[PDB]
Amino acid sequence: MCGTEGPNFYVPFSNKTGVVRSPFEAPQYYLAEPWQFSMLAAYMFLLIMLGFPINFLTLYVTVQHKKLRTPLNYILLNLAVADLFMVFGGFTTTLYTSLHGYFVFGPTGCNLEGFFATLGGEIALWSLVVLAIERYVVVCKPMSNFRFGENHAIMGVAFTWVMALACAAPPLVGWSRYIPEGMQCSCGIDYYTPHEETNNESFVIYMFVVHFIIPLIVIFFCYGQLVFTVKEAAAQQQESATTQKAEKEVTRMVIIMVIAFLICWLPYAGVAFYIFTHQGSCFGPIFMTIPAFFAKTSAVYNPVIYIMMNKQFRNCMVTTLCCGKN
């Protein structure tokens, strides 16, 4: 008796005192104090205020700077758009519901806000995967006579939308479901409930393997094989000081990317390990929602790492911000 079940929701609080209400109808202040809902709102405001300009400025400077519109950069524009789906489909909605203390848009808004928030983060995820595959193909040259062009870059972008739809869409048609999560102001995939009518179990396994394990293996193989290729080539040109400098910065950048991906990936595995073991107990409105809580920040630090630290974009954006000068 950990929570209160209802049609289209699961509140992580016991109704033995009769105070639980539908997360679609009334504030959930038994889950958390009003000021904690405010701090949830303040966190969404921070994400909006950092995440909109950075990701929008990424799209804007690409319009103003011809050098950025290369095919290898398409997937980074895709990342920028995905983060904007997170900012507007997710963070902005959640700022609004947060300040009511429940999901005021009803179950219909739940499927909508759950779709677009989930799609956004899933496109971002697979953009980091596709970018690693592309960099691996361009550097390690696994295919004999191959040249990466506009057509290949478009396939990569389309591929992320297919993978994101492969996660975000089934809950609208009967495999898993969208429900309010945590403090009941955002909607998402149901990992909290063994809903047999929508076969929640097999979807969690499908998510764990296809949308969690596979991304880690591809990112690690590709980038590891790339660092290996760059390090062997540098080893054969050791008197080229710039080749050595270029080798160090590629390695340093792969480490930053992979570490930043683990900062978002390991919390889910940490919580996962707390459900493989420690299966019996109940989970508060914060337990499985801690990884989701902190993964939202990827809408800010991913463009900082992949776009803002890109030597090209950085100078482009400085010129754009500075009305053309410097």
Ligand X SMILES: *C(=O)CCCCCCCCCCCCCCC
Ligand Y SMILES: *[C@@H]1O[C@H](CO)[C@@H](O[C@@H]2O[C@H](CO)[C@@H](O[C@@H]3O[C@H](CO[C@H]4O[C@H](CO)[C@@H](O)[C@H](O)[C@@H]4O)[C@@H](O)[C@H](O[C@H]4O[C@H](CO)[C@@H](O)[C@H](O)[C@@H]4O)[C@@H]3O)[C@H](O)[C@H]2NC(C)=O)[C@H](O)[C@H]1NC(C)=O
Sites of contact with ligand DL2 (CB under 6 A): 125, 191, 204, 207-208, 211-212, 215, 264-265, 268, 271-272, 295
Q: Give the whole-angstrom CA distance, residue 56 versus residue 157.
A: 18
Q: How far apart are the first and last CA of the chain?
A: 63
Closer residue to ligand X in complex, CB, 46/246: 46
How deeply is 33 buried, as exposed, middle or buried, from its count of CB atoms within 10 A (0-12, 13-18, 19+)?
A: exposed
Binding of ligand Y at residue 14 (CB under 6 A)? no
Using CB under 6 A as the binding criterion, the count of chain residues that bind ligand X stands at 4
Out of ligand BOG, ligand Y, ligand DL2, none, which partner does residue 208 contact, by CB within 5 to 8 A per kind? Answer: ligand DL2
Nearest to 109 by CA among 47, 23, 175: 23
Whether the Cβ atoms of residue 57 and residue 320 lie closer than 8 Å to each other? yes
Provide, rounded to whole angstroms, the least separation between the CB of residue 91 and ligand DL2: 15
Out of ligand BOG, ligand DL2, ligand X, none, which partner does residue 301 contact, by CB within 5 to 8 A per kind? Answer: none
Q: Give the whole-angstrom CA distance, residue 22 versus residue 99.
A: 16
Using CB under 6 A as the binding criterion, the count of chain residues that bind ligand BOG stands at 42
Nearest to 156 by CA among 257, 215, 71: 71
Tokens of 185: 């102001």
Binding of ligand X at residue 324 (CB under 6 A)? no
Residue showing tokens 């409105």: 285
Closer residue to ligand Y in complex, CB, 9/91: 9
The residue with its CB nearest to ligand BOG is: 188
201 is in an annotated binding site: yes
Provide, rounded to whole angstroms, the least separation between the CB of residue 101 and ligand X: 27
Binding of ligand BOG at residue 90 (CB under 6 A)? yes
Tokens of 210: 């296809």
Using CB under 6 A as the binding criterion, the count of chain residues that bind ligand Y stands at 7
Tokens of 164: 């994101």
Provide, rounded to whole angstroms, the least separation between the CB of residue 228 and ligand BOG: 8
Name 5's bridge partners. Answer: 10
Out of ligand X, ligand BOG, ligand DL2, none, which partner does residue 71 contact, by CB within 5 to 8 A per kind? Answer: none
Whether the Cβ atoms of residue 265 and residue 212 lie closer than 8 Å to each other? yes
The beta strands (E) that lie in the chain are given as 4-6, 9-11, 178-181, 186-189
- For 318, other C-beta atoms within 10 Å of its C-beta total 12
Q: Give the whole-angstrom CA distance, residue 153 versus residue 166.
A: 20
Residue showing tokens 């095919």: 71
196 is in an annotated binding site: no
Report the residue from 58, 176, 298, 310 that binds ligand BOG according to the rule CB under 6 A.
Answer: 298
- For 41, other C-beta atoms within 10 Å of its C-beta total 17
Report the residue from 264, 300, 305, 317 that binds ligand BOG according to the rule CB under 6 A.
Answer: 264
Task: With contacts defined by CB under 6 A, name the span among 54-62, 140-148, 198-206, 218-226 that binds ligand BOG.
Answer: 218-226
Binding of ligand X at residue 326 (CB under 6 A)? yes
Binding site, annotated residues: 201, 279
Q: Which residues lie near ligand Y (CB under 6 A)?
A: 4, 6, 15, 18, 20-22
Q: Which residues lie near ligand BOG (CB under 6 A)?
A: 27, 33, 90, 94-96, 99-101, 117-118, 121, 124-125, 128, 180-186, 188-189, 220, 223-224, 227, 251, 254-255, 258, 261, 264, 285-286, 289-290, 292-293, 295, 298
